[PDB]
């Protein structure tokens with residue numbers, strides 16, 4: 001019923017102009033997690049409208065309103081992999097569209113697929129990684145462990161289940177060819193969010209950046225879509241320091257909850273998921289150096305206007321070294337007590 005009245009307003013009230021959301025809404029400096037969650041479904045419609053997808057693809061407005069709410073409701077509330085993550089990843093896709101001239105690189109339908117994939121790419125995340133699905137012998141591992149990318153296959157399957165819900169198939173007027181294309185793109189893009197997949201294709205991404213993007217090379221299109229999806233997925237690290245500090249809190253809260261579960265199963269968690277071993281500043285520096293910075297360096301190599309993104313990621317990484325000394329207890333704790341020693 002609450003879904004129903006939210007739908008009624010989303011459908012009949014009109015799509016707010018994107019500029020009314022925030023006067024910096026289309027800037028790389030904007031932090032979409034500042035938007036109240038109650039306003040995010042309308043902001044999705046505003047972005048879809050501003051990218052001209054609603055008109056270009058003649059999306060049915062009741063269907064689209066239903067779809068957007070179904071996707072939002074398809075996220076649970078772990079500390080990090082929740083709807084506000086999917087919303088902020090989608091918003092970064094919109095930023096890429098508005099700032100980087102993606103139409104010189106990608107087909108319209110590929111840009112559309114990228115944005116819809118961003119909305120859907122973590123659907124029904126339970127706050128645990130692929131390794132945990134296998135180790136805990138979850139239903140998801142029973143379905144997909146033999147293919148790999150367990151969670152990402154689930155996210156994709158959830159996206160399809162939403163489309164296959166009556167009243168929610170925003171593509172169902174597409175030609176059979178275009179429908180097959182959209183769903184194939186969604187598969188490839190959502191599966192690209194597995195960082196194991198990123199790490200596997202990284203050399204090919206480097207080689208594409210080295211030789212130069214060839215808009216007539218179908219494999220270049222696929223590679224670029226993967227890179228852009230990863231860039232959206234990690235885009236929290238391209239904001240200022242307070243965003244990255246908070247996002248670190250959320251990720252490690254989620255990780256440490258998984259680690260507590262693995263210990264209860266008699267298994268040794270990864271150091272980064274073990275609240276007794278993980279040293280957050282060094283793990284964040286390592287993640288920035290070895291994963292985040294190279295991704296945004298490739299993005300800048302391909303799109304010079306993305307330079308500020310890489311510079312911000314590098315700065316945030318420098319901040320971690322600067323604050324690391326504060327994880328060492330000087331003097332006495334604030335209570336003047338050493339009772340934590342016992």
Ligand SMILES: Cc1cc([C@@H]2CN(C(=O)c3ccc(F)c(F)c3)CC(F)(F)C2)n2ncnc2n1
Nearest residue numbers: 195233234235236237247251272283284286287
């Ligand atoms: C935006 C953002 C997203 C993630 C993570 C990265 N992920 C990892 O596997 C991972 C995590 C920590 C590491 F140190 C590492 F080497 C790998 C997958 C994920 F958990 F989904 C999201 N992190 N992690 C730390 N700061 C992050 N910032």
Ligand SMILES: [Mg+2]
Nearest residue numbers: 121122193194
């Ligand atoms: Mg994911």
Ligand SMILES: [Zn+2]
Nearest residue numbers: 085121122233
């Ligand atoms: Zn994600």
